[PDB]
Scaffold this active site. Structure first.
Site, PDB file in Angstrom:
ATOM      1  N   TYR A  59       0.826  -1.208   0.000  1.00 49.59           N
ATOM      2  CA  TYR A  59       0.000   0.000   0.000  1.00 49.59           C
ATOM      3  C   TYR A  59       0.859   1.257   0.000  1.00 49.59           C
ATOM      4  O   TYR A  59       1.791   1.382   0.797  1.00 49.59           O
ATOM      5  CB  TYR A  59      -0.946   0.049   1.205  1.00 49.59           C
ATOM      6  CG  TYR A  59      -2.390  -0.131   0.812  1.00 49.59           C
ATOM      7  CD1 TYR A  59      -3.075   0.905   0.173  1.00 49.59           C
ATOM      8  CD2 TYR A  59      -3.075  -1.307   1.076  1.00 49.59           C
ATOM      9  CE1 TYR A  59      -4.407   0.772  -0.216  1.00 49.59           C
ATOM     10  CE2 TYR A  59      -4.412  -1.455   0.695  1.00 49.59           C
ATOM     11  CZ  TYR A  59      -5.069  -0.408   0.046  1.00 49.59           C
ATOM     12  OH  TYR A  59      -6.385  -0.540  -0.346  1.00 49.59           O
ATOM     13  N   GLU A  61      -0.682   4.739  -0.652  1.00 50.27           N
ATOM     14  CA  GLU A  61      -1.549   5.887  -0.865  1.00 50.27           C
ATOM     15  C   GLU A  61      -0.737   7.173  -0.826  1.00 50.27           C
ATOM     16  O   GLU A  61       0.196   7.318  -0.033  1.00 50.27           O
ATOM     17  CB  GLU A  61      -2.647   5.933   0.198  1.00 50.27           C
ATOM     18  CG  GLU A  61      -3.658   4.805   0.127  1.00 50.27           C
ATOM     19  CD  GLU A  61      -4.549   4.814   1.341  1.00 50.27           C
ATOM     20  OE1 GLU A  61      -4.036   5.183   2.412  1.00 50.27           O
ATOM     21  OE2 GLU A  61      -5.744   4.473   1.233  1.00 50.27           O
ATOM     22  N   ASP A 215      -7.494  12.517 -25.560  1.00 48.92           N
ATOM     23  CA  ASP A 215      -7.428  11.133 -25.090  1.00 48.92           C
ATOM     24  C   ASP A 215      -6.748  10.344 -26.205  1.00 48.92           C
ATOM     25  O   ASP A 215      -7.360  10.006 -27.220  1.00 48.92           O
ATOM     26  CB  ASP A 215      -8.811  10.592 -24.772  1.00 48.92           C
ATOM     27  CG  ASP A 215      -8.803   9.115 -24.402  1.00 48.92           C
ATOM     28  OD1 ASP A 215      -7.719   8.476 -24.372  1.00 48.92           O
ATOM     29  OD2 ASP A 215      -9.907   8.598 -24.141  1.00 48.92           O
ATOM     30  N   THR A 241      -4.592   5.266 -22.188  1.00 48.67           N
ATOM     31  CA  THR A 241      -4.299   3.920 -21.712  1.00 48.67           C
ATOM     32  C   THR A 241      -2.862   3.560 -22.051  1.00 48.67           C
ATOM     33  O   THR A 241      -2.203   4.203 -22.870  1.00 48.67           O
ATOM     34  CB  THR A 241      -5.206   2.863 -22.341  1.00 48.67           C
ATOM     35  OG1 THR A 241      -5.123   2.945 -23.773  1.00 48.67           O
ATOM     36  CG2 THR A 241      -6.621   3.031 -21.895  1.00 48.67           C
ATOM     37  N   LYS A 244      -2.821  -0.391 -25.287  1.00 47.41           N
ATOM     38  CA  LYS A 244      -3.203  -0.533 -26.689  1.00 47.41           C
ATOM     39  C   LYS A 244      -1.958  -0.423 -27.553  1.00 47.41           C
ATOM     40  O   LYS A 244      -1.045  -1.244 -27.399  1.00 47.41           O
ATOM     41  CB  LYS A 244      -4.274   0.480 -27.090  1.00 47.41           C
ATOM     42  CG  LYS A 244      -5.538   0.357 -26.245  1.00 47.41           C
ATOM     43  CD  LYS A 244      -6.427   1.574 -26.436  1.00 47.41           C
ATOM     44  CE  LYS A 244      -7.609   1.520 -25.474  1.00 47.41           C
ATOM     45  NZ  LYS A 244      -8.817   1.847 -26.222  1.00 47.41           N
ATOM     46  N   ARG A 250      -2.338  -3.001 -18.616  1.00 47.28           N
ATOM     47  CA  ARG A 250      -3.582  -2.230 -18.518  1.00 47.28           C
ATOM     48  C   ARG A 250      -3.432  -1.182 -17.418  1.00 47.28           C
ATOM     49  O   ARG A 250      -3.377  -1.527 -16.240  1.00 47.28           O
ATOM     50  CB  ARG A 250      -4.753  -3.163 -18.212  1.00 47.28           C
ATOM     51  CG  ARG A 250      -4.844  -4.407 -19.106  1.00 47.28           C
ATOM     52  CD  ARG A 250      -6.233  -4.556 -19.668  1.00 47.28           C
ATOM     53  NE  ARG A 250      -6.211  -5.246 -20.950  1.00 47.28           N
ATOM     54  CZ  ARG A 250      -7.146  -5.119 -21.876  1.00 47.28           C
ATOM     55  NH1 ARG A 250      -8.170  -4.280 -21.720  1.00 47.28           N
ATOM     56  NH2 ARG A 250      -7.034  -5.816 -23.006  1.00 47.28           N
TER      57      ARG A 250
HETATM   58  C1  LIG Z   1     -13.083   0.234   3.918  1.00 48.39           C
HETATM   59  C2  LIG Z   1     -12.305   0.492   2.617  1.00 48.39           C
HETATM   60  N1  LIG Z   1     -12.964   0.505   1.441  1.00 48.39           N
HETATM   61  C3  LIG Z   1     -12.327   0.722   0.271  1.00 48.39           C
HETATM   62  C4  LIG Z   1     -10.961   0.937   0.277  1.00 48.39           C
HETATM   63  C5  LIG Z   1     -10.278   1.216  -1.064  1.00 48.39           C
HETATM   64  O1  LIG Z   1      -9.422   0.191  -1.444  1.00 48.39           O
HETATM   65  P1  LIG Z   1      -8.476   0.474  -2.742  1.00 48.39           P
HETATM   66  O2  LIG Z   1      -7.152   1.056  -2.332  1.00 48.39           O
HETATM   67  O3  LIG Z   1      -8.365  -0.857  -3.414  1.00 48.39           O
HETATM   68  O4  LIG Z   1      -9.138   1.449  -3.698  1.00 48.39           O
HETATM   69  C6  LIG Z   1     -10.267   0.938   1.454  1.00 48.39           C
HETATM   70  C7  LIG Z   1      -8.747   1.182   1.428  1.00 48.39           C
HETATM   71  N2  LIG Z   1      -8.266   1.475   2.767  1.00 48.39           N
HETATM   72  C8  LIG Z   1      -6.815   1.528   2.797  1.00 48.39           C
HETATM   73  C9  LIG Z   1      -6.373   1.525   4.255  1.00 48.39           C
HETATM   74  O5  LIG Z   1      -7.242   1.455   5.170  1.00 48.39           O
HETATM   75  O6  LIG Z   1      -5.147   1.589   4.538  1.00 48.39           O
HETATM   76  C10 LIG Z   1     -10.934   0.713   2.636  1.00 48.39           C
HETATM   77  O7  LIG Z   1     -10.270   0.691   3.879  1.00 48.39           O
END
Ligand SMILES: Cc1ncc(COP(=O)(O)O)c(CNCC(=O)O)c1O
Ligand SMILES: Cc1ncc(COP(=O)(O)O)c(CNCC(=O)O)c1O
Lengths: 462, 99, 99
Positions: A59, A61, A215, A241, A244, A250
């Protein structure tokens, strides 16, 4: 509780024979037909090794150097490598262009671009679907049902090709834009066989005060190799994308101008809005295996070999076009400047669905496509995928011959069973002419190389 | 009507006496080739050619037709800017005999 | 005679051939004499022959003459040969161009 190696290190062929067998059957299908879906390609093994890797576990983010969690020492390097390679692949100065490489695919990339620069219900125009445009550029039915999310959350209006030439009617676009006043004009499309006058789009956008987004999903590999007009000369934002003509995994990317604006000491403001729209507004954690695989593809796209591939794609589309056109068939605009041809089937009284169906029965994958903007009366044919298997012009002329046979068989089944789908399907059964054509396509397809996996080890070789 | 024409072409048209030591040695080889060990040998030859071909492609080398279905591989050296002459000469010196 | 008869019968067995459908001659000194005797059996001088082109993987005894017209193989000296080639894209025999 299973020990780690039983559930976690055992290969797929043992852990799940069902899925292993289905993938092996899919690999065999990819090796025994003629893949003419213009958006499809065959990517490299090296890309696939990055895609199927431990990068999926992390992860991350946020964005490099400004994450919400730790442990991103190496993910940051991979994403930063991917971004700098993206700018290089398209010959962009890193002080005038930025790029976000987190979008999960092309459609999320487009919607995130819109979220960044538009408010809900702002006006957008893009190329009409019957004229060659894509769903994400806006689409609603004659009955007013909003279908695309772009038409649900913003206010879209399509522009069309000229109904006699098949080229974009740039004068009607300018008129429609002055009437409608979009905040965003989209160029690029899915089934347009010509290049784009981006300079003219910029003149129209400046006249009506619109942002201009391209695009470039379909032609992005050709753009990278400098084989078609570059949208970066004139557009504010460029989405794409990566799977292609670019021949990668993808994924999606959003390119955006940055730095001072061309002639108030004004500057572009896209960078922060674009990044914020992808995360935290729309997406979650980035798919780091996609980003690693994309970095691999972008390095491969920057190579002299890929420039030769892009040339060959355009040359194969032209050779296929000319072959069909020397048989007396009609192409929308009577040719192509890119990777695809639009085959106007109406002068044959055939619907694109009949030709698509009999082709699929002979392992030839095309797709019906509306023609000149008008029951789709044509089929779309693209060169990138079979070019990636090494086919050159004479091989695409043989593809042309295969298509000529399939269409002749369709006429023949129609002139015997009738133009009704309930009747036409009666001729598609227990048919030696179809069985023969299928056999010829299979034997033809098998002679060509296949990137992505060890051919000698495939389970199915019949 | 092949049998008489073929026998006659071999003798008296083209050859003189048969080389009977070759014929006896050949009879031995044909007995050995009819054995289960020889069937396994032939499978192994094919497997060895494939395994070598796959190793070379993994290093970025180009095979003609991209693989093999029999006992040999054909290695196209032009993508490397090399001739067959140089590669054959160099590893003849390292006791590797190719052609 | 017994050694040659044994060689012939073992040749047929090693290739899984019925002796009512196949015969064999085991006297050719080598492969090149075997081929030239086969040609002599079924062809007259200057009869036309096609075989796989040498740059496409064929053998000298299947015919070979140079760009300059020099006839190298005895097959091309005593018969009228024309080569067929592999497909320039795939490296497989181009069956349609051969036909
Ligand atoms: C309850 C919940 N729903 C959806 C997502 C989204 O998942 P994606 O990253 O696949 O888009 C998360 C991500 N939560 C990340 C965390 O708690 O660290 C989440 O905790
Ligand atoms: C004068 C002469 N020249 C050539 C040959 C041919 O030899 P080969 O069998 O090796 O092809 C013979 C054979 N003469 C056999 C005999 O006189 O009994 C010969 O007698």
């Amino acid at each position: 509780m299973d020990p780690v190696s039983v559930w976690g290190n055992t290969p797929l062929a043992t852990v799940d024979p069902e899925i292993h067998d289905l993938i092996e059957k899919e690999k065999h299908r990819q090796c025994r037909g003629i893949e003419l879906i213009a958006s499809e390609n065959f990517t490299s093994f090296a890309v696939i090794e990055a895609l199927g890797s431990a990068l999926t576990n992390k992860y991350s983010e946020g964005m490099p150097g400004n994450r919400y969690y730790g442990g991103n020492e190496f993910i940051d390097q991979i994403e930063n490598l991917c971004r700098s390679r993206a700018l290089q692949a398209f010959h962009l100065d890193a002080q005038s262009w930025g790029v976000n490489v987190q979008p999960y695919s092309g459609s999320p990339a487009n919607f995130a671009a819109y979220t960044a620069v538009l408010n809900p219900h702002d006006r957008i125009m893009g190329l009409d679907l019957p004229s060659g445009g894509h769903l994400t550029h806006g689409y609603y039915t004659s009955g007013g049902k909003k279908i695309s999310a772009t038409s649900i959350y913003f206010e879209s209006l399509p522009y069309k090709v000229n109904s006699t030439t098949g080229y974009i009617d740039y004068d009607r676009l300018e008129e429609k834009a002055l009437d409608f006043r979009p905040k965003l004009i989209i160029c690029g499309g899915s089934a347009y066989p010509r290049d784009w006058d981006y300079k003219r789009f910029r003149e129209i956008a400046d006249k009506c005060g619109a942002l201009l987004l391209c695009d470039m999903a379909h032609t992005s590999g050709l753009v990278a190799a400098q084989e078609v007009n570059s949208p970066f000369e004139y557009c504010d934002i460029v989405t794409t994308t990566t799977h292609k003509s670019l021949r990668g995994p993808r994924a999606g990317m959003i390119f955006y101008r940055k730095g001072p604006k061309p002639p108030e000491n004004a500057v572009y403001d896209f960078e922060d809005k674009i990044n914020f729209a992808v995360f935290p507004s729309l997406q979650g954690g980035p798919h780091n295996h996609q980003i690693g695989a994309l970095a691999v593809a972008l390095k491969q796209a920057a190579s002299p070999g890929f420039k030769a591939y892009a040339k060959q794609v355009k040359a194969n589309a032209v050779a296929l076009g000319n072959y069909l056109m020397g048989k007396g068939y009609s192409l929308v605009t009577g040719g192509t400047e890119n990777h695809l041809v639009l085959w106007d089937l109406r002068p044959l009284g055939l619907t694109g669905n009949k030709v698509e169906k009999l082709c699929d029965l002979c392992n030839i994958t095309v797709n019906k496509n509306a023609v000149f903007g008008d029951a789709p009366g044509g089929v779309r044919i693209g060169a990138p995928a079979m070019t990636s298997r090494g086919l050159v012009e004479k091989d695409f002329e043989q593809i042309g011959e295969f298509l000529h046979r399939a269409v002749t068989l369709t006429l023949e089944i129609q002139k015997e069973h009738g133009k009704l789908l309930k009747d036409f399907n009666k001729g598609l059964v227990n048919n030696k002419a179809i069985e023969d054509l299928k056999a010829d396509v299979e034997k033809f397809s098998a002679t060509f190389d296949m990137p992505g996996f060890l051919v000698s080890e495939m389970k199915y070789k019949d």
